[PDB]
Amino acid sequence: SDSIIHIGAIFDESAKKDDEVFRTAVGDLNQNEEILQTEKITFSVTFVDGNNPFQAVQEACELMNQGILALVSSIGCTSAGSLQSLADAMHIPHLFIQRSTAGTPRSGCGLTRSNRNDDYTLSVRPPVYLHDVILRVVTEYAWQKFIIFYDSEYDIRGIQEFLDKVSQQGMDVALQKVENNINKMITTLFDTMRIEELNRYRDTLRRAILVMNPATAKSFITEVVETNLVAFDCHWIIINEEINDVDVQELVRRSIGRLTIIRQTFPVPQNISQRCFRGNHRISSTLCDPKDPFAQNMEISNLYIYDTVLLLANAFHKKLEDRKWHSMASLSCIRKNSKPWQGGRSMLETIKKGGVSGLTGELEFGENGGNPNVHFEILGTNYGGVRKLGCWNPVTGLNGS
Amino acid sequence: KVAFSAIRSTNHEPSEMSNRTMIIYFDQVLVNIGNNFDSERSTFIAPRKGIYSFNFHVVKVYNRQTIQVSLMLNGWPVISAFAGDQDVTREAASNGVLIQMEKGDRAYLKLERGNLMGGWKYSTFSGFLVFPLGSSGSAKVAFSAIRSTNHEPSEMTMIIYFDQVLVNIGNNFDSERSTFIAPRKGIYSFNFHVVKVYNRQTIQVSLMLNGWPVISAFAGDQDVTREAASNGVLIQMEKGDRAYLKLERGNLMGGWKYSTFSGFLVFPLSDSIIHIGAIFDESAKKDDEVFRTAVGDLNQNEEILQTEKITFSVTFVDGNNPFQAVQEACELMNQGILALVSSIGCTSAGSLQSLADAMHIPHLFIQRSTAGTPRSGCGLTRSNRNDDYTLSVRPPVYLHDVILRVVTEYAWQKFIIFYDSEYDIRGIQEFLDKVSQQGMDVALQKVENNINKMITTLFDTMRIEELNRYRDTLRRAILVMNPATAKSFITEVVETNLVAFDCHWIIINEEINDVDVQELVRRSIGRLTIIRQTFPVPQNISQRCFRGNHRISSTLCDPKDPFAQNMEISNLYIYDTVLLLANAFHKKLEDRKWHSMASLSCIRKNSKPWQGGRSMLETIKKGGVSGLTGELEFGENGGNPNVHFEILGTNYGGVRKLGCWNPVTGLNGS
Ligand SMILES: [Ca+2]
Numbered sequence A: 001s002d003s004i005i006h007i008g009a010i011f012d013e014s015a016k017k018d019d020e021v022f023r024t025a026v027g028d029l030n031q032n033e034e035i036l037q038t039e040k041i042t043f044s045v046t047f048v049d050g051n052n053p054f055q056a057v058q059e060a061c062e063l064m065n066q067g068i069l070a071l072v073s074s075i076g077c078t079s080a081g082s083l084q085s086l087a088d089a090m091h092i093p094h095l096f097i098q099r100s101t102a103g104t105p106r107s108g109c110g111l112t113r114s115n116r117n118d119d120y121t122l123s124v125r126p127p128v129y130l131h132d133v134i135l136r137v138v139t140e141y142a143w144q145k146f147i148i149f150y151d152s153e154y155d156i157r158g159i160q161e162f163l164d165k166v167s168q169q170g171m172d173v174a175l176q177k178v179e180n181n182i183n184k185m186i187t188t189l190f191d192t193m194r195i196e197e198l199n200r201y202r203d204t205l206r207r208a209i210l211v212m213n214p215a216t217a218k219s220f221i222t223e224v225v226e227t228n229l230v231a232f233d234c235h236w237i238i239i240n241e242e243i244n245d246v247d248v249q250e251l252v253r254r255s256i257g258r259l260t261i262i263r264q265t266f267p268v269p270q271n272i273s274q275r276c277f278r279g280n281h282r283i284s285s286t287l288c289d290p291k292d293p294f295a296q297n298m299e300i301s302n303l304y305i306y307d308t309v310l311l312l313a314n315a316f317h318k319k320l321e322d323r324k325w326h327s328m329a330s331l332s333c334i335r336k337n338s339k340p341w342q343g344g345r346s347m348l349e350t351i352k353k354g355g356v357s358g359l360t361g362e363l364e365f366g367e368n369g370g371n372p373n374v375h376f377e378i379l380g381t382n383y384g385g386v387r388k389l390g391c392w393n394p395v396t397g398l399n400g401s
Numbered sequence B: 001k002v003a004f005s006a007i008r009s010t011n012h013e014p015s016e017m018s019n020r021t022m023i024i025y026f027d028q029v030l031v032n033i034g035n036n037f038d039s040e041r042s043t044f045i046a047p048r049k050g051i052y053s054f055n056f057h058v059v060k061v062y063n064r065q066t067i068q069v070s071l072m073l074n075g076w077p078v079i080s081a082f083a084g085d086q087d088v089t090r091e092a093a094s095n096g097v098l099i100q101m102e103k104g105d106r107a108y109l110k111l112e113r114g115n116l117m118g119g120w121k122y123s124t125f126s127g128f129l130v131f132p133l134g135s136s137g138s139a140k141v142a143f144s145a146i147r148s149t150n151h152e153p154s155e156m157t158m159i160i161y162f163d164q165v166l167v168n169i170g171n172n173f174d175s176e177r178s179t180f181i182a183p184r185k186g187i188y189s190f191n192f193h194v195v196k197v198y199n200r201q202t203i204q205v206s207l208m209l210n211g212w213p214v215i216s217a218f219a220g221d222q223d224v225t226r227e228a229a230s231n232g233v234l235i236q237m238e239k240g241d242r243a244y245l246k247l248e249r250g251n252l253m254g255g256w257k258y259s260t261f262s263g264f265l266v267f268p269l270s271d272s273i274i275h276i277g278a279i280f281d282e283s284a285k286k287d288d289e290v291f292r293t294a295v296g297d298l299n300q301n302e303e304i305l306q307t308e309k310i311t312f313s314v315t316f317v318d319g320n321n322p323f324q325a326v327q328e329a330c331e332l333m334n335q336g337i338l339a340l341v342s343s344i345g346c347t348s349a350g351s352l353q354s355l356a357d358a359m360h361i362p363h364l365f366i367q368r369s370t371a372g373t374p375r376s377g378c379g380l381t382r383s384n385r386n387d388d389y390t391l392s393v394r395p396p397v398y399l400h401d402v403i404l405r406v407v408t409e410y411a412w413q414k415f416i417i418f419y420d421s422e423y424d425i426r427g428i429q430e431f432l433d434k435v436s437q438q439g440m441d442v443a444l445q446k447v448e449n450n451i452n453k454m455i456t457t458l459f460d461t462m463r464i465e466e467l468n469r470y471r472d473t474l475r476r477a478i479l480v481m482n483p484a485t486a487k488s489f490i491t492e493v494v495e496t497n498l499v500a501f502d503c504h505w506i507i508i509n510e511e512i513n514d515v516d517v518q519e520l521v522r523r524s525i526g527r528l529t530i531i532r533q534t535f536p537v538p539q540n541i542s543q544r545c546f547r548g549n550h551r552i553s554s555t556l557c558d559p560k561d562p563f564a565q566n567m568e569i570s571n572l573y574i575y576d577t578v579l580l581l582a583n584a585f586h587k588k589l590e591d592r593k594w595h596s597m598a599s600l601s602c603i604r605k606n607s608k609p610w611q612g613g614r615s616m617l618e619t620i621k622k623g624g625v626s627g628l629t630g631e632l633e634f635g636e637n638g639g640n641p642n643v644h645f646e647i648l649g650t651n652y653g654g655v656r657k658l659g660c661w662n663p664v665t666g667l668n669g670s
């Protein structure tokens, strides 16, 4: 058929959970009699190879031909720019949820905003503040010498500013990529390196920062511990937006010195019953029950996807309620003659000025089209068990020790 | 009044359907009186009983395979024609005949043998009603005879015999004597096609009018399997005048099967074969100039593409806009191209690479860096299960290997790396790993594009003890930046006494021209080492502007020329890329294995790839040319392996060559 409210979605082939949660969000909203009271949300989803930006563009174009009010994407940077540039050309509001590769910490995409042109892409996840946070924490601990370990997917441009600053303060900072198989890495090491090197190496590991996905960190921590490359006096920091409660418990278990864990956190209500509601809106218990295996295994992008669907629904609702609806249009991509959606500008403005309370806390956009809200918690344990040391956000800064 | 005329107006390859049905298609219809010709099916449906005339000319472009074209009447072949020469530019399968047709009878051309890879531009198919039957007029005279057998001649120097008579309205053609006797005064038309199977002898066939030759035709030259002596004419004949074919020269050993002889009473009394597309960043004006110069140079070269001119289409795009790149690339593919050349940054490379792979268009990618910043790898994901149509024309980025090797030679243990604001530090991630592994003390700093406020800020901001630490650190530095920023940066630090005579700085960038090098040395006051890419170019300044018989515009090869001295590296690669393609097309054409370009459609999940793409890609990929960069060629992984770096130095108190580096032999010299 053909509904009044139609949205498109492009997901990486790895984003099965994004798709499930996207559909759950639509489902939840359709049960909500207070939002879109006489209109059901319909959607079209396409999975693409996120390393294939033409396929992303191709499939996105097909959705626009069907006719959509907005495009939700959950993809890496490789295809983001193609989609962003398409969205701008077609005036289709584009809600972009950045996914990182293999749980590696995020680094900025560097999506070139449109100066003379209007930018139709909204960045749903907050800016990457990893470099700011890690610097602040390192400064608090008065470190002067330490090693930064990063996994094989991480984009070190994410810490270029960090490296500049530590150098400027005269610190001694080593860099090493950690191969995805730790066992052969460390075995190789002992064979390859001689004694005096390993002694130098051991000393260097007394203070380290891990910029990697928790799975690789787990294996890495264990292997160094078991091989006596660290000792009780060591202090390691792990930083990643995405480290779930199960990962945190396991990291602590595996470590034998002091460990500091820095991860993103989401303001979620007290009284476990009200966790699954936002006002009159009921959220599927599978997403909000933190005893649920799904909930404990959700990727961060999954939470943002829920709030994105939530945000759009409220945007459409307000537009409908105000009796200022502009219909979707069937667009054509590869036609240098083809025109943009005449409804796009007003829809974009409405979505852009929208705000909802969801699983991530507050989702909204600033004047620059990006979500400003983000919070980091800082966990610790000296061994001999984990507790909250402090919190960080980009406006108030560090709180606690 | 019934007549039709159709031509092939494009060089484009046959459709999937044409390959399956084998029916030769003609896209442009000049005449269609009565609309009895179905342009979609390329078939003529006879509207009434009568004698009809058909003529066809099927052109075989740079094809090695022999072809057989037959005129079909309701699924049965009437006349056939061959164009199986094995080393010829363009050859035609031509023949004609007069046949009787009933209402609803279907006439069309079928490709009984071979294929039309190279396309069949200029091929023609026309026909008309000579006169109807049943509807009466002594002005109805026509005959048509063919040789249906391979049998040797009957003790033939003599008259060419035709055993099978298809048409004989008026019974004026004596089949036994193969002679036409004009029944009345009028203008008569004659056409003949005599097929002479290579009997190691040339033949001359003449149309005779009362023992006198009117028109003549020749065959039997070359080693072509089946060749025809064809010609036609309109002549006035009187009653009892005799027209026939005589074999004036040679013999017909091997038979003359498929030979035709017909005649009747008239009344009684653009788009080129070689097209490439190009996508350039808006900043790439010099790439465009040099691209066009290369095409120009090749078109003057009589030894390459000797009978074919290269044409092209160029589009400029915002290289930070990958959709526009894809959009404009798609438009080029719709026009129809054999290859896509790009000169663009990494931002749009992946979109173009992925498009190329989808459409099977060979894609020759020339990486451009931003603002002369040193290159870092794009990280273009090669296709594993899929075939990768993108060829990387510039060599791999070896900056990290080279800088490490040089640093190792100087026994540095402590130094600072300076990089400009466009540089992608992933380029040195491996370098940083290794120096850390060897226990070195390495600082990193980005250099803002305005040095003056950077250093001024510094002195204000930093206190004494920091600046002393900072001064010490600058005694050994590496600059990973464009030369313009480096120039300004070197001067400002020198003038502000942040370095001294004992310092040693290294500058590394593929792209640093001779003017830049001289200026850097001038500005520096300690030891300076400059590492840049170099291109093996001949001695004797005269031979610099030639590669064999190929002449290069002096503006590119004269190193006193301002252009030459100002060329970006990408400019050189663009020249060699055009050069390489031309040789690839040449070899493919010469070998008579051409496959035509196709008009493709992008955003159509149904749309198919170019069927010619695989063979073209393989040919280009295995190509190699000598050009401005030295040798351009591709390895098994689809990338250019050739690269050379020179290492220049001066201790102050003037620059000289310290050594050379390449990735196979390694470092040479000190
Ligand atoms: Ca423990």
Ligand SMILES: [Ca+2]
Residues within 6 Å of the ligand: B521, B522, B523, B524, B525, B652
């Ligand atoms: Ca000097």
